[PDB]
Design a binder for these strands. Structure first.
Ligand code: ZN
Length: 675
RNA sequence: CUGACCCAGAAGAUCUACUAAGUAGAUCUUCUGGGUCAG
């Protein structure tokens, strides 16, 4: 058995008396072993003929698997039954039987939320000890807060039933939107009332051991200047002006479609303006349908090209010009191969006229991003002293990950670096996700004396995921909140670690400094709370809980009624009729398909299974995909590909999700496909 | 029955920027259902 340290025993001491405790301790101090000690002491306290049941909550699948393994290995000699349920372990055995036939259960919180909503688990009285991992997530509409709402409704309801003891583990409670110490204290009291905690446990009499175990890295701030002369931006701005003039020719009122004023190229405000203009131009209707179709298609193309130009400007701002040029080239190749008509012909020719000068500019070694030069200098200096350095690099977008990996690999001065890539799992319009086995493989490969010494990642590596110790942390234009800042510096716990923040904007550094001051506010508030009498704290928490319960009980609102009128679905790019809502069928309340031979003529299929597109030539707008259901291969459509026009009134509306569109949803019938 | 891959829905949190609380864009996570390949 591992020998517990003194500060671990001090942290676990309040919980071993049966008090609801939030344990706040730095990252890397071993809160898992503290939870193990608390669970071991809790289970052995019951008299003969009685038993206690413990549930552990994990927020991610890898953490759930790791906790299940740790608990199973630690309690295997004691004769306790350990199990776990998650998304991959759910539809096998009834959950109530699994809970009743085990002593320690590792869960994802949504499983318990689902089973409490269903009624399979009627109450939380079946557990005697509840442990929340990363307890700072217990706010707003998180599943943690749903479980705690169930708990608190049972508590403040007169139901004389036993309730479990609640333990939470975190590294930072946070301050929310606090500006002074009073607001921070109010926020911390509210968080304590969420978890029914009356004690906050910190290391006081054993600080020296904690510092010899966990070391806080030194923080640096690096501000750089932007480019002096930008020819790339000049050319792209001229192209954007020409496109804007072309769009104004068709639509004379373009400047009154959006209320954004003083827009500038290459900014988020311009992107909001162009998105608003796009959504306004796709609902224009005219008595003449051919004129409406041609005008809407022209405006669609113009606005899409303007949006791509703005995206390229932003990419060039945060990376090399070559990345932006490649992005534009890929878009224009897809445009050339995606329904080349006369307007697309003109736009492509106008781009090709300047492509030569664009390529000449991006290949000049005097136009490199100063941010990249500073990053290269930092990496060179840090790896000169310690050749065995392990680095992690935080960026904002998934495209920046690939751009920086390419820049590192192509850099002759960074030949000692072996980049590794880590992104999220979900899929986007331009990027594919990363599967769990791939993430585990890269995480295992990234370590000392391994295949990689530098990791480029998005916010995946912020919380929960176990990573090898890093001597260097670089934040590339990367600032969040106080919890994120405290967690991020828990990655360089090694002695002599450093953290660097790289930016060309002063507000970024100012925000990081504001976070560093809010941290002191939070520490002072915690120290003030620990000196109160426990009865007064309990009364305060009870009052807060009563007020919150009253508000949330009064907040509940009803659900409106869907519309029974027939509607038309039109192509969002060319306004051609696709189908009516009378031909839409729902498969198992989540797949939407179209029945009839008329719809089959309105689309073409081009090769997973084949996608479907608008059959009208020169448009080829994406409409959906083919899926297999039982013995049938039917097509499924996306609501965000169509404009919804009412038959009677004639107004047109846009929707982004199928739940926003309220209409009669007729279930699919296998024998219906005969009329 | 195990793995590996994909598709469709829905929910949650964070950040930035707008308009007069909502809106866009980005990042990450979770749950439900439908398929493919290998053993
Ligand atoms: Zn079309």
């Amino acid at each position: 058995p591992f020998k517990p340290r003194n500060y671990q025993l001090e942290l676990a001491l309040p919980a071993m008396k049966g008090k609801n405790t939030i344990i706040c301790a730095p990252t890397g101090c071993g809160k898992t072993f503290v939870s193990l000690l608390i669970c071991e002491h809790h289970l052995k306290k019951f008299p003969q003929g009685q038993k206690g049941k413990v549930v552990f909550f994990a927020n991610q699948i890898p953490v759930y698997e790791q906790q299940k393994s740790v608990f199973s290995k630690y309690f295997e000699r004691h004769g306790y039954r350990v199990t776990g349920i998650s998304g991959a372990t759910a539809e096998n055995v009834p959950v109530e039987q699994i809970v009743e036939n085990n002593d320690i259960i590792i869960l994802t919180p949504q499983i318990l939320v689902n089973n409490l909503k269903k009624g399979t688990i009627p109450s939380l009285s079946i557990f005697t000890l509840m442990i929340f991992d990363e307890c700072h997530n217990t706010s707003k509409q998180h599943p943690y807060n749903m479980i705690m709402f169930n708990y608190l409704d049972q508590k403040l309801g007169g139901s004389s039933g036993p309730l479990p003891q609640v333990i939470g583990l975190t590294a930072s409670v946070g301050v929310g939107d606090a500006k002074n110490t009073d607001e921070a204290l109010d926020y911390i009291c509210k968080l304590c009332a969420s978890l029914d905690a009356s004690v906050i446990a910190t290391v006081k009499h054993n600080l020296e051991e904690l510092e010899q175990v966990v070391y806080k890295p030194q923080k640096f701030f690096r501000k750089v200047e932007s480019r002096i002369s930008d020819k790339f931006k000049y050319i792209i701005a001229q192209l954007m002006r020409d496109t804007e003039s072309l769009a104004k020719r068709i639509c004379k009122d373009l400047e009154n479609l959006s209320q954004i004023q003083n827009r500038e190229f290459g900014t988020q405000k311009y992107e909001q303006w162009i998105v608003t203009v796009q959504k306004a131009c796709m609902v224009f209707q005219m008595p003449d349908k051919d004129e409406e179709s041609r005008i809407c298609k022209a405006l669609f193309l113009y606005t899409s090209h303007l949006r791509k130009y703005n995206d390229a400007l932003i990419i060039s701002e945060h990376a090399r010009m070559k990345d932006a040029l490649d992005y534009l080239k890929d878009f224009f190749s897809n445009v050339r191969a995606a329904g080349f008509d006369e307007i697309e012909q003109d736009l492509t020719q106008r781009f090709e006229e300047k492509l030569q000068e664009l390529e000449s500019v991006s290949r000049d070694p005097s136009n490199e991003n100063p941010k990249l030069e500073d990053l290269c200098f930092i990496l060179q200096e840090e790896y000169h002293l310690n050749p065995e350095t392990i680095t992690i690099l935080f960026v904002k977008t998934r495209a920046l990950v690939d751009a920086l990996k390419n820049w590192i690999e192509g850099n002759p001065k960074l030949s000692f670096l072996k980049p590794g890539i880590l992104t999220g799992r979900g899929k986007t319009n331009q990027n594919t996700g990363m599967t769990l086995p791939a993430q585990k493989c890269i995480l295992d490969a990234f370590k000392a004396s391994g295949d990689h010494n530098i990791l480029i990642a998005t916010s995946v590596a912020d919380e929960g995921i176990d990573i090898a110790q890093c001597n260097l942390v670089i934040l590339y234009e990367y600032v969040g909140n106080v919890i994120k800042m405290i967690q991020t510096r828990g990655r360089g716990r090694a002695r002599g670690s450093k953290c660097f923040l790289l930016t060309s904007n002063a507000g970024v550094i100012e925000k990081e400094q504001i976070n560093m001051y809010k941290e002191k506010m939070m520490n002072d508030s915690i120290l003030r709370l620990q000196t109160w009498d426990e009865a007064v704290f309990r009364e305060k928490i009870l009052h807060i809980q009563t007020h919150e319960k009253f508000i949330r009980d009064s907040q509940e609102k009803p659900k409106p009624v869907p519309d029974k009128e027939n509607k038309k679905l039109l192509c969002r790019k060319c306004k051609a009729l696709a189908c009516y809502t009378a031909d839409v069928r729902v498969i198992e309340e989540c797949h939407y398909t179209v029945l009839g031979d008329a719809f089959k003529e309105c689309f073409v299929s081009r090769p997973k299974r084949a996608k479907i597109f608008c059959a009208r030539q020169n448009c080829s707008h994406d409409w959906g995909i083919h899926v297999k259901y039982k013995t049938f291969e039917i097509p499924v459509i996306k609501i965000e590909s169509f404009v919804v026009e009412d038959i009677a009134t004639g107004v047109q509306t846009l929707y982004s999700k199928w739940k926003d569109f309220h209409f009669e949803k007729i279930p699919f019938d296998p024998a219906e496909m005969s009329k």
